[PDB]
Design a protein around this ligand. Structure first.
Ligand SMILES: CCc1c(N2CC[C@H](O)C2=O)cccc1S(=O)(=O)N[C@@H](CNC(=O)c1ccc(Cl)s1)C(=O)OCCc1nccn1C
Ligand SMILES: *[C@@H]1O[C@H](CO)[C@@H](O)[C@H](O)[C@H]1NC(C)=O
Lengths: 27, 250, 11
């Protein structure tokens, strides 16, 4: 149930340096 | 990875290194999908043309890593294989069709800041995200160019390519169990997976539920990062029935 | 040569 949520990113509401590049492509 | 960057700490906590005991060396990437199951490419374990046919005892899985070569004391976990399962219709003879294998670990791995499973896609997530131009992310410790090795895990984001552009790039027969990714020749950005990255994950972050999904497995390419060529990935959703049958049975 | 020696228990 906890798959795909990273302890050092999603679980802390922190973004990695390039994930926004993926979101922006989902047009 | 060619024209990637250094991973951030805990950026890919599902990334697994397939490690040969024998001559101690990197064989492949892989991914953690639960506390006992690791996903990789079949050709990382079986490839008759190059006399590759590994048994459980030949291999270890190293989980939670960042450094390629360092023993990451108190961070990495090293696991023994109980059993390898290769897709029964894996086609090593022609084009690596159905390039997918599972490894069951002897013992469950403890999750941590550095060790956490990726999600496998459902039909809906696959249908939404596997669209030409949408980017995924590829990670591994393979070669930095076709013809150095990295100090640490490398990352690159790459766009999914239209099926006709994938087919027209190659003489190899491309199947519905494959997709391709990469930039076109004069786009201004490049990058690719390379030797030693195969078996690792192509992941996408769902904008619906903010979870990472493994849409692909690094399978093959002609060389690495060649203009006009693309990387080919195993279509994980297409083979999910087999994945579910192996985990449900074993 | 390349890789750091891992604990002898994993081998
Ligand atoms: C002609 C391509 C190829 C084949 N293939 C596959 C179709 C056909 O069956 C065939 O003959 C087989 C071996 C070697 C090569 S290769 O030497 O041209 N390219 C290498 C390095 N590039 C990359 O790994 C990547 C680039 C982008 C992504 Cl994505 S992976 C490669 O694909 O190795 C991974 C595969 C592998 N490694 C050792 C054993 N195996 C099976
Ligand atoms: C791979 O190895 C196993 C165990 O040695 C053997 O049963 C199988 O026939 C081999 N497969 C190929 C394709 O060589």
């Amino acid at each position: 149930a906890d798959c795909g949520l990273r302890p050092l990113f999603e679980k802390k509401s922190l973004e990695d340096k390039t994930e926004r590049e993926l979101l922006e492509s989902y047009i | 990875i060619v024209e990637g960057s250094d991973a951030e700490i805990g950026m890919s906590p599902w990334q697994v290194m397939l490690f040969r005991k024998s001559p101690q060396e990197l064989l492949c990437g892989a991914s953690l999908i639960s506390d006992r199951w690791v996903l990789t490419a079949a050709h990382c374990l079986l490839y008759p043309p190059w006399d590759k046919n590994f048994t459980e005892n030949d291999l270890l899985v190293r989980i939670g890593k960042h450094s390629r070569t360092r023993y990451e004391r108190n961070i990495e976990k090293i696991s023994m294989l109980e059993k390898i399962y290769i897709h029964p219709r894996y086609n090593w003879r022609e084009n690596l069709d159905r390039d997918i294998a599972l490894m069951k670990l002897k013992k469950p791995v403890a999750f941590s800041d550095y060790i956490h499973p990726v999600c496998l896609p459902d039909r809906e997530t696959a249908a939404s995200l596997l669209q030409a131009g949408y980017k995924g992310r590829v990670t591994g410790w393979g070669n930095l160019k076709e013809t150095g090795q990295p100090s640490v895990l490398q990352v690159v984001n790459l766009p999914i390519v239209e099926r006709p552009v994938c087919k027209d790039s190659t003489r190899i027969r491309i199947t519905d169990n494959m997709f391709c990714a990469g930039y076109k020749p004069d786009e201004g950005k490049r990058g690719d997976a390379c030797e030693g990255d195969s078996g690792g994950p192509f992941v996408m972050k769902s904008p619906f539920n903010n979870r990472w999904y493994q849409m692909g497995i690094v399978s093959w390419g002609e060389g690495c990062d060649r203009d006009g060529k693309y990387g080919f990935y195993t279509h994980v959703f297409r083979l999910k029935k087999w994945i579910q049958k192996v985990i449900d049975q074993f | 040569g390349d890789f750091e020696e891992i604990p002898e228990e994993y081998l």
